[PDB]
Amino acid sequence: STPVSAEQQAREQDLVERVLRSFDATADPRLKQVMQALTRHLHAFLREVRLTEAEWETGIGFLTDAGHVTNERRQEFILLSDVLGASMQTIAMNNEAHGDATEATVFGPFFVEGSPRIESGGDIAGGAAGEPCWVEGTVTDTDGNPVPDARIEVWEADDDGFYDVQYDDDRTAARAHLLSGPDGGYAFWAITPTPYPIPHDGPVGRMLAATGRSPMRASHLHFMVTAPGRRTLVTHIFVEGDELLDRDSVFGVKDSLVKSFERQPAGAPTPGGREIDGPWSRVRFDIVLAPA
Amino acid sequence: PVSAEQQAREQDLVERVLRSFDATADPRLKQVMQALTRHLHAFLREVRLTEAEWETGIGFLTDAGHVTNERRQEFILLSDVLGASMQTIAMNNEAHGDATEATVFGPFFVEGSPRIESGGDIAGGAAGEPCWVEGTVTDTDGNPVPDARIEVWEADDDGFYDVQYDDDRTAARAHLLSGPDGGYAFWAITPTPYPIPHDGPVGRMLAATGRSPMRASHLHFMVTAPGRRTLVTHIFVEGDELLDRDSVFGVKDSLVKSFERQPAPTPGGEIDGPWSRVRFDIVLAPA
Ligand SMILES: [Cl-]
Ligand SMILES: [Cu+2]
Ligand SMILES: [Fe+3]
Ligand SMILES: [Fe+3]
């Protein structure tokens, strides 16, 4: 729609102006800039869609429900940021990869401080069910130097799609950290990653259901890599051929992070001579760290 | 400062999120989600939000979420201090001739207020200067609206609404019916400024932005009548220093009224000391 009269347009515009000038005294000029931009976009959204009072109530309830479900592990506001692409966008603006630097992507909620320490050629599965997957590669800097003693945190879901922290028996599984060797090398046994849904029993899940979207993530293994003077890398690698690669629920996929997970025959000869019942896979991931 | 390549990367991400909603069954939900996506990313890309700022914003929402309702509603208060509540009111109470402008209720409206007769007193034990309020309720063609139900509520001299006390008292709160000529009047209290709840993240945001939680002095009204568009509104005090810094943007120029201190015979004959009087003519649009 119904055409907004000039009088009515003028009233709405006057209000946006009142809100913007409310921030004029803000002491930190970046905070001021952020709050004024937030104002303009929030009011532009409201005035574009002509939000109704019932719709406003719905949004308020949504936020409130997200507040009530958010706790020590579960972070519904971060999941909302994830499914709206705001997390990936914020990573993209702050982590432009120059030269050969590995691309960054979403962190998620399932990183735990204090992961067990393994050696190269060790095994992060720690009880977790899944097909054995051998992961290897090299850490270098953007000048091509191997980087020994870079800290490599790795974590992933098991075959039922759960991170160890999601269980209630304080188990540790499918996570560890290791340190790159003298030639920058790292390797470990893990499990072949498979798709799982993000937490979807809260408001974010309701919004996904109402919009006909899926909570499912494309298969991945997480990596967080740190080294002195290097920009910390938060990333994961995806599985080439995975049908979810174009519909990841948190838009975390980048082509350069998709890796060939190569299935090996049952009985095929294994790194370190490990004995395996049936198939196993292997994947290579070379990591390049940029300057801080 | 943003490369061609980086700009394309950012816009393509926005495009992918917009396309993720293409199967939503309800066309209005789909429209709202796509608009919300566009404006959110436009914000992010305009300020180049840092990961630190993103964390601060999430922590802020989280802290608000843990304030938790039963009079205390921090997301509503956040909507209020960002002007989103008053914008929603405006768009849903559009201009219609000289129909009185609407506002939010705020958190202190109470069902079951006491009935007074026109000329009665709403104070009911509340401290403050007596204030005579009078006027007429008409429609947008100027016809008096008889038997319109007028609710009024306000804070006392200490800036508290009756329900904020621990004793179940009723004060500075009532309703009455307009007369055959649309006329209404009652004794109330000359309103003074008080703060919105400021011990939560809303308060923290206001402090960090140099903003005061103080409300400009006001009386609240709700007016209903068969066939008329219900009005929820405030009136404010001409010359109040706070008029251009109301913390929840309740103030409209049109709702500012002249509260004239007297010195001086009382309407309807009571006690004395100083007293103020105000005229408020109310105009209701069609439902
Ligand atoms: Cl815009
Ligand atoms: Cu916008
Ligand atoms: Fe994950
Ligand atoms: Fe009030």
From Swiss-Prot, chain A:
Optimum temperature is 50-55 degrees Celsius. Inhibited by 3,5-dichlorocatechol, chlorohydroquinone and 4,5-dibromocatechol. This is Hydroxyquinol 1,2-dioxygenase. Catalyzes the ortho-cleavage of the aromatic ring of hydroxyquinol. Fe cation binds at residues 163, 196, 220, 222. Optimum pH is 7.5. Binds 1 Fe(3+) ion per subunit. GO terms for molecular function: 4-hydroxycatechol 1,2-dioxygenase activity; catechol 1,2-dioxygenase activity; ferric iron binding. The chain holds residues 2 to 239 of 293 of the full protein. It catalyses: benzene-1,2,4-triol + O2 = maleylacetate + 2 H(+). Its EC number is 1.13.11.37. GO terms for biological process: beta-ketoadipate pathway; catechol-containing compound metabolic process. Pathway: Aromatic compound metabolism; beta-ketoadipate pathway; 3-oxoadipate from 3,4-dihydroxybenzoate: step 2/4. Keywords: Aromatic hydrocarbons catabolism, Dioxygenase, Iron, Metal-binding, Oxidoreductase. Its cofactor is Fe(3+). It comes from Nocardioides simplex (Arthrobacter simplex). Belongs to the intradiol ring-cleavage dioxygenase family. Homodimer. Disulfide bonds: none annotated.
